Design a protein around this motif. Structure first.
Motif, PDB file in Angstrom:
ATOM      1  N   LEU A  54       0.849  -1.194   0.000  1.00  0.00           N
ATOM      2  CA  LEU A  54       0.000   0.000   0.000  1.00  0.00           C
ATOM      3  C   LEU A  54       0.887   1.248   0.000  1.00  0.00           C
ATOM      4  N   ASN A  55       0.599   2.201  -0.888  1.00  0.00           N
ATOM      5  CA  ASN A  55       1.399   3.430  -0.970  1.00  0.00           C
ATOM      6  C   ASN A  55       0.997   4.501   0.034  1.00  0.00           C
ATOM      7  N   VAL A  56       1.992   5.139   0.647  1.00  0.00           N
ATOM      8  CA  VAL A  56       1.736   6.223   1.585  1.00  0.00           C
ATOM      9  C   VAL A  56       2.699   7.378   1.300  1.00  0.00           C
ATOM     10  N   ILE A  57       2.335   8.560   1.777  1.00  0.00           N
ATOM     11  CA  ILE A  57       3.168   9.749   1.628  1.00  0.00           C
ATOM     12  C   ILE A  57       3.156  10.379   3.018  1.00  0.00           C
ATOM     13  N   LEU A  58       4.330  10.451   3.637  1.00  0.00           N
ATOM     14  CA  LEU A  58       4.467  11.013   4.977  1.00  0.00           C
ATOM     15  C   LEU A  58       5.220  12.331   4.870  1.00  0.00           C
ATOM     16  N   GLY A  59       4.663  13.400   5.435  1.00  0.00           N
ATOM     17  CA  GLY A  59       5.331  14.684   5.343  1.00  0.00           C
ATOM     18  C   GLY A  59       5.104  15.605   6.519  1.00  0.00           C
ATOM     19  N   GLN A  60       5.545  16.847   6.349  1.00  0.00           N
ATOM     20  CA  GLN A  60       5.439  17.873   7.377  1.00  0.00           C
ATOM     21  C   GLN A  60       4.701  19.078   6.788  1.00  0.00           C
ATOM     22  N   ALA A  61       3.703  19.578   7.510  1.00  0.00           N
ATOM     23  CA  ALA A  61       2.938  20.728   7.037  1.00  0.00           C
ATOM     24  C   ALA A  61       2.733  21.703   8.187  1.00  0.00           C
ATOM     25  N   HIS A  62       1.840  22.667   7.996  1.00  0.00           N
ATOM     26  CA  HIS A  62       1.543  23.640   9.035  1.00  0.00           C
ATOM     27  C   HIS A  62       0.243  24.331   8.647  1.00  0.00           C
ATOM     28  N   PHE A  63      -0.465  24.870   9.639  1.00  0.00           N
ATOM     29  CA  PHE A  63      -1.733  25.576   9.440  1.00  0.00           C
ATOM     30  C   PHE A  63      -2.877  24.599   9.177  1.00  0.00           C
ATOM     31  N   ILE A  64      -4.000  24.840   9.843  1.00  0.00           N
ATOM     32  CA  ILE A  64      -5.171  23.986   9.729  1.00  0.00           C
ATOM     33  C   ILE A  64      -5.694  23.807   8.297  1.00  0.00           C
TER      34      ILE A  64
END
Lengths: 161, 161, 161, 161, 161, 161
Positions: free
Chosen positions: A14-24
């Motif tokens: 199964l493919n996933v993309i894990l990252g870092q973000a900000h703001f709702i």
């Protein structure tokens, strides 16, 4: 401070993309970017709000995938991390452009269908993602036959002419 | 090798963008990218030269913000890292596109207004940024009422129609 | 789990770009992105397949540059990591745009010509890149004469008018 | 078929961005792209629906600007054309990136504060934008004093260092 | 209003990029974009200022190419048009990414090495570029031998693997 | 020189993207960009080579769509123009990002599902695209009820939350 290794739980391949973000606004913007990028795309998205109510936020087009994204983010417990879980037949190459371009996205740790574990650091009510163990270590180097094999594979998959 | 945890000093209402770059042109290019992206933008920028004179370089439109970027970089002491401190009312969603597109920028570690701490590894006269603790761990998962509240928030802020 | 520090070997004057990607198409896509970006560019590229045969894949213009890329990547031994070694006279600012835009590329850890060391984490048959020691720690902050120097430098190099 | 010349009217100091898009989502997407790019941005946006009820659609943060955008677009009367009028102090360089990246945007005909006339071809109930008369013809070529002048100007404005 | 057809003067061995921009910063920004994209690039750039002094502005790394760029803009006489003349061995694919991303660039009319003529409309002291005759009309449709040849050609040139 | 109006043959349930490119690599690059953007995408692509053999080049994942693209380009007969015909259910918003990013692509004239006609100028063995009549002129302006309707439509379609 302590280091931990957290495996991502998901069906094999199964493919996933894990990252870092900000703001709702991360949640609505990424959901919109994904559905605009691929028609009928099936995915689940979770984002870890790191202040205020500090609630894991979720959105998606497939409940099975949304559940996986949320449960895994609860395990990671890292402020501002986001996780996109893609349905079968949908690939990161189809949507990374949209994730990279999202105004709320800061960086992407990994995009893969391989088994993965996340290295994290913890201190007080905070955690940081230090890296990702994406798949396995190399067993060698491709020979001429392997070079021909990968070139041919892409042609049979329709990615190269 | 030793692991350290370095808190980033900054007023709670200010946003910071911490990343990795290379080449001295990083300073002028980022400064130009910022003023071209937002009119009248106020910010402070610092870049850690990692060779030659090995001097922290800085530029900005607000002296107090420039000083803050330089002070934090001196504490981080990581070669080729850069830090942008945005003045009140200027947000990362307004400028991340220009930072991401800057030819000297390699990656961005964090873009946030939350309490930030950096995990670094040190060996001799070298340091590496391993990750960042951005804000806090999750306290729970949103329900539909909370989903409605965050949708309402963005419409009231004028980000969604 | 164990942390290790892996030094990168290469001539002092060569630039390298170390990053994270996924999918075997990474090789042809990056090779094409580089030759499309700069006419006559010289480089070596290696990508670490993290599943299946788990073979380091390589492509390039000169055997010596390809050897550098493959040799170093094998030492790193991290799944889905890629390394580009640029020949003399070719710079990361010339090609980072194409690397960032590559659909298989997830992120870029570093782009530099400075002495480089990579921090990795290992657990079983998996490794993760946690960070990079790019060059050295700062010795001070630039003064007015140094600000003037770097501005003039860019004009003499032809990067600023 | 007949050719017509349509003037675009707006306050002398204000900028307009005239382009081609498609799909009704153009309105909300561009409005969001603009407010995400610059904090507190004031503008008026109009889009000419080319089929269905064929209604000019509009949105914005300033009534006077929205009215101006709609009135100009009604005069142009070209299917799928969009027009953004930016308030005083807000410039195309601040937002073109977001207009270009909008999934519904096909191309941009002009971005300017100069007197603007649009060349259109008309046939039946269809019109096509053939080009723009943006400002005036050249009166000569700059000499070195003029080069020094434009360089000084950008340094005084803070766009170059 | 009158329509005119203006041939672009350019050696058969050179490539040109003709587009539309705005704001005086177009000159320094595009020159910087080109030298940042390709090391040692030889080019000539001209931009038609459409207000104020209304002067053709010039910048470049090869005086002969700069003069050719200027000569062509004096013939076209269209406000806000820009022209880049690339020296032998430098191609549009190497730099279009930088031209497209330039904040002052609105659009690009053509990029080519073929004979080029520009259709313009004139009214008073204003002119509009309506389109470009880039090369010649088609002589037929490729058969399989021709498909194979265009594929083989790219592999022999090194653009495809 | 003479002006002509060329209608584009396009069944009502299909979308088209008409643009300008250059260099023979346009064909493989655009085909690859499309299949990388959307899994299982059905389309036809044609490119009017304007030099050398001057052949309409063709590539795609559906023979009828390819033939439709080729037929249209033989009618248009404009050097360096390309046309993508998207199969039912595949939309320009899904792929415009990839078309815009293609190094050979200079600009896009139109992306639409509405009736389209192309204004062209002809002189000798060359033709230039001057503009596109995309859909129809406006019949009025949306009132508050229609605004509510278009907002509701996007939520029902799943493009907005």
């Amino acid at each position: 401070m302590e280091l931990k290794l957290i495996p991502i739980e998901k069906p094999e391949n199964l493919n996933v993309i894990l990252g870092q973000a900000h703001f709702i606004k991360t949640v609505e913007d990424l959901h919109e970017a994904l559905v605009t990028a691929v028609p009928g795309i099936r995915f689940g998205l979770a984002f870890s709000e790191a202040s205020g109510k500090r609630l894991v936020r979720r959105s998606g087009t497939d409940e099975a995938l949304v559940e996986l994204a949320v449960k895994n983010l609860l395990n990671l417990a890292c402020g501002h991390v986001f996780l996109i879980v893609l349905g079968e037949g949908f690939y990161p190459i189809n949507v990374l452009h949209a994730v990279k371009a999202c105004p709320e996205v800061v960086r992407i740790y990994a995009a893969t269908a391989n088994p993965l574990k996340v290295v994290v650091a913890e201190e007080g009510e905070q955690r940081a993602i230090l890296g990702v163990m994406d798949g396995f270590t190399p067993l060698g180097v491709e020979d001429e036959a392997e070079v021909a094999w990968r070139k041919d594979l892409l042609r049979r998959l329709g990615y190269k002419l």
